[PDB]
């Protein structure tokens, strides 16, 4: 019986995800937004406190990802490619700026499972972003000044987020786009009677990323809306205003995770 | 904060699945099959031994499920309805006949997550079965003698199982269809460096079903094949012989789980 | 080459749909609704006029279908099963009551193609309805008094319709359900430059159904709303009030189609 | 009653596709292949004849497409993005070399409808290709020598094509059949539209083109005939970006 996640199996192939290293390359459409500080604070786990400078600030990201491990798994895009929508909210952890992730949606089950292991609270959704093609022409925006990119996310057949950015200038400090570490919550419940309120796993974690790289980073303006949907709470973080729109490529490897 | 599974949230609505009770009503197309005893034995976890009488016997099931909890969630079929394919394999636990579930596929993420909590090693797949309609006519089989029903399962765009049954007569003892208790494995890994081989949760469990009911049960003949697929190991349990085909409605409630 | 729809092929198997007969068995959750008479009239093709008694009335249906033809195609549910949401609107054709279908959504491409051939203006969508299971218990409504059934439709990831019905009693006259014949529009455009407004096929048709049967028909109360969505116009027929809710099984065969007027 | 395709509507918004112009930008992973000449010939419509020099040759393409029209429709990727797998087969038209398209699969209904209008015999499928990301790293190949790309296509939950290319080195009109049947009794063998057409592309552009080696197989599937053009051997694999606009179609 081999495997990292279920199903465990004789050859360790059937598992939804094998053991790390997990490698990632993606393209991000991002929007800085501001919600009610109290609404953001309401989502925070016990160990985190509101950001004393930017409470209410968040970032919405729509990402086209490609995953691989040690065996050129990216040659199997029917399993290795997925699209993802998440928000993070500014917070502090012991006086240090961090980014809490309350909600995140993906269109792939393996990504969802790798997510839960990392503490990303992933559910299935349908996510899309405008793509730039280097050939150019009227079927594509330019990845440069004036380039417009749309993005959307749905869950259970309901639209939950719609966004648009217009690029203006290169990001002068690309590496600093990843400055705030992400905080997550590994959580796995119990089903034994009497224990439904006593999860087997429940721990605050900090995302650890190896060999992070950012390229082709652009900044501009942005529009963003969250839409009310049955069975979702994203829109309870209403967009009071939008800040910068961002477009960049992102790569890293995951082999570790810090339990806080 | 509130909720049973992730994401936890201010109102406990965004969670992929709320706490039990979980109620189920389903229609099952079932096929008894026989594979190599050694191939079946290779899938067994520590704690289970080969069945001394029927090693190699298993049952493939294709199910059209509807879920609900305490608030008429069946009124939201976009979330509550799903289709599922699984196999069980005859085994023994401490000299008692049981049914081990190595592989199971479902077309809904909430069902998948509830599955992991139960120890069902669910992955996403596309599952279909012929339906009988009371109105009759050339668009439907009869739920009765001569009625033919097809069923298929795919995962990652690859067909993994194809089945057909032809009904002959009512099941003589419908209550006995669910006689072998199902054994599963709750399993949730760690990502902390050095601990990828030390899962946080790893325990054999017995499925506990409340108020189990079966109706409209028919038996007849069957054909079943498992197809080799990249990233799957189902077809490593080759169908050497097909036994009985079954068609029945099934209902039960989940509130508990027995850790062995 | 062989085949009925594209792709045509050496063996006539690859086609999205073969020739009729097309057989259908389905379960319907239906809602009678009332919108603005002028909104309904705005969708009507040339040839149809407003209903002088019930202008603004329509019916929304959510259907779990199973298709088959001459070879037990229902044994291949990955191709033959699908879910469908449509509306019809009361109208008149030369003084006769008919039902115009402006919008319809389905989760299966073969159904979409067979639809286009019939003049049903089908697009892809995601459609669901609560199911009743004979075994009973807390996972299912009863198909009977008090039974509640929800239904929804989305397109392109946007929710466009949400419905609920509560059953009260058997339909008194099931034979008279959806008694208005359905009118559709076969339409296939041209792409040749200069001809983008000169479609190759453009004709009003009346749906012809063979051996129609209904069973297990119940009526009760209903709630229905259409939701605004980008790239959709369904919600421009706002539900001002709802009438009866319905639940029934439906079966028929298609082999024919009546052309009313070409272009 | 405005609109280009159905549904026609009061505002012309609900239609599956509006009128041209239709603009496209895409990335192609492709494989040249050789099947049995007689198998290719069996797919040919009236009006096309076997290629006297390369009968049996075809090309398989897996494409990640983005569409737009006159209103920045590419800002709505939930409708405007799609993935497509097709094959073409070498043939001749009136003594002249062309590429016949017998089979093609897309993951989007609007693309399927625009396809039928063009005479592409599109059905729904699930199509995927490896993507190259500029940022680089172990999650992506690098366009250039040694760069490896996989691609697959499925239909009705069945895998029908699997391909892989390895790039080595930097670097025919399509014929289709518009076809729309009749349902009126007695007329099921008498289609309302049935005409051979040549694809007309405006402002075509190709960029960043690479060729290399390739593997390709078509898998037998219920309800499909693609694998009845068995890949006997593969030629070149290739990778490139492609753009063009559609406003016209030539009836032959």
Q: Which chain C residues are Cβ-neighbours of B76 within 8 angstroms?
A: 150, 152
Helices (H), chain C: 37-42, 77-80, 109-118
Distance (Å) from the alpha carbon of D61 to chain C's nearest alpha carbon: 17
Whether D119 and D179 have beta carbons less than 8 Å apart is answered as yes
The answer to whether A11 is annotated as binding is no
Experimental method: X-ray
What is the distance between the alpha carbons of residues B174 and C227, in angstroms, rounded to a whole number? 45
Q: Check CB contact under 8 Å for C257 and D10.
A: no
At C178, list the tokens.
Answer: 């959806």
Q: Are strands C81-93 and C49-50 parallel, antiparallel or unpaired?
A: antiparallel
Q: Check CB contact under 8 Å for A26 and D77.
A: no
Is C260 in the D-facing interface, judged by CB distances under 8 Å?
A: no
Q: What is the resolution of this structure in A?
A: 1.4
Is A231 in the C-facing interface, judged by CB distances under 8 Å?
A: no
- Closest by alpha carbon to B217, among B47, B68, B30, B25? B30
- Closest by alpha carbon to A159, among C231, B258, B35? C231
Is C2 in the B-facing interface, judged by CB distances under 8 Å?
A: no
- Quick check: helix, strand or coil at residue D111? helix
Q: How far is CA B94 from CA B52, B118, B177, B258, D178, in A?
A: 12, 21, 22, 15, 67
**Residue A136 domain boundaries:** 1-260
Q: Which chain B residues are Cβ-neighbours of C164 within 8 angstroms?
A: 75
Q: How far is CA C249 from CA A96, B72, B140, C192, C216, in A?
A: 62, 23, 12, 44, 6
- Opening angle at CA B244, ends B239 and B247, nearest 5: 115
How many residues are listed for chain C in this entry?
Answer: 263
CATH number at residue A257: 2.40.400.10
Terminal-to-terminal C-alpha distance of chain C = 30
- Closest by alpha carbon to B111, among B82, B154, B137? B82
CA dihedral C122, C128, C134, C135 (to 10 degrees): 150
CA dihedral A167, A168, A169, A172 (to 10 degrees): -70
At C151, list the tokens.
Answer: 């239904």
Tokens 């609270």: give the residue.
A121
What is the distance between the alpha carbons of residues C117 and B75, in angstroms, rounded to a whole number? 34
Q: What share of chain C is helix, strand, coil (3-state, %, to 5)?
A: 10, 50, 40
What is the distance between the alpha carbons of residues C162 and C246, in angstroms, rounded to a whole number? 15
DSSP state of D54: T
DSSP state of B69: -
Sign of CA dihedral C19, C20, C23, C24: positive
Q: State how many domains chain D has.
A: 1
Cross-strand bridge partners of residue B164: B150, B223
What are the two backbone dihedrals, phi and then psi, of residue B175, each rounded to the nearest 5 degrees? -65, -25
Whether C123 and C146 have beta carbons less than 8 Å apart is answered as no
Terminal-to-terminal C-alpha distance of chain B = 30
Is A158 in the D-facing interface, judged by CB distances under 8 Å?
A: no
What is the distance between the alpha carbons of residues C3 and A162, in angstroms, rounded to a whole number? 42
The answer to whether C24 is annotated as binding is yes
Q: How far is CA B185 from CA A5, B101, B122, in A?
A: 11, 9, 11
Distance (Å) from the alpha carbon of D211 to chain C's nearest alpha carbon: 30
Beta carbons within 8 Å of A141's beta carbon, 6+ residues apart: A130, A132, A147, A148, A149, D74
User: Which one of C66, C72, C150 has the shortest CB-CB distance to B148?
Assistant: C72
What is the distance between the alpha carbons of residues A61 and A129, in angstroms, rounded to a whole number? 10
Beta carbons within 8 Å of A188's beta carbon, 6+ residues apart: A116, A199, A200, A201, A202, B116, B117, B188, B200, B201
Q: Cα B17 to the chain's mean position, in Å?
A: 18
Q: Which chain B residues are Cβ-neighbours of A16 within 8 angstroms?
A: 123
Q: What share of chain B is helix, strand, coil (3-state, %, to 5)?
A: 10, 50, 40
Question: Which residues of D define the annotated binding site for pyruvate?
Answer: 24, 114, 118, 122
Element (H, E) at A106: strand A96-106
Q: Which of residues 33-92 of A touch D (CB under 8 A)?
A: 64, 66-68, 72, 74-78, 80-81
At B138, list the tokens.
Answer: 């050339």
What is the distance between the alpha carbons of residues D16 and D28, in angstroms, rounded to a whole number? 25
């Amino acid at each position: 019986m081999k495997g990292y996640t279920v199903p465990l199996s004789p050859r360790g192939i059937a598992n939804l995800a094998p053991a790390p290293p997990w490698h990632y390359a993606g393209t991000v459409v991002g929007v800085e937004f501001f919600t009610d500080p109290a609404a953001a604070a309401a989502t925070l786990p016990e160990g985190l406190t509101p950001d004393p400078d930017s409470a209410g600030r968040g970032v919405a990201m729509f990402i086209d990802w490609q995953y691989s491990s040690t065996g050129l798994e990216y040659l199997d895009p029917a399993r290795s490619q997925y699209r993802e929508f998440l928000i993070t909210l500014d917070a502090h952890c012991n006086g240090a700026p961090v980014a809490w992730c309350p909600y995140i949606y993906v269109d792939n089950d393996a990504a969802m499972a790798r997510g839960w292991v990392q503490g990303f609270p992933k559910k299935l959704g349908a996510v899309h972003q405008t793509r730039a093609y280097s050939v150019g022409g009227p079927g594509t925006p330019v990845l440069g000044p004036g380039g417009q990119f749309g993005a959307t996310a749905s869950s259970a057949g309901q639209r939950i987020a719609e966004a648009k950015i217009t690029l203006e200038q290169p990001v002068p400090d690309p590496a600093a786009l990843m400055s705030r570490p992400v905080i997550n919550l590994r959580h796995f419940p119990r089903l034994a009677a009497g224990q439904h309120d006593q999860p087997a796993v429940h721990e605050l974690v900090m995302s650890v990323l190896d060999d992070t790289a950012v390229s082709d980073a652009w900044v501009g303006t942005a529009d963003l809306a969250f839409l009310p949907a049955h069975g979702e709470e994203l829109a309870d973080l209403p967009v009071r205003r939008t800040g910068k729109g961002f477009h960049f490529d992102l790569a890293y490897t995951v082999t570790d995770l810090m339990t806080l």
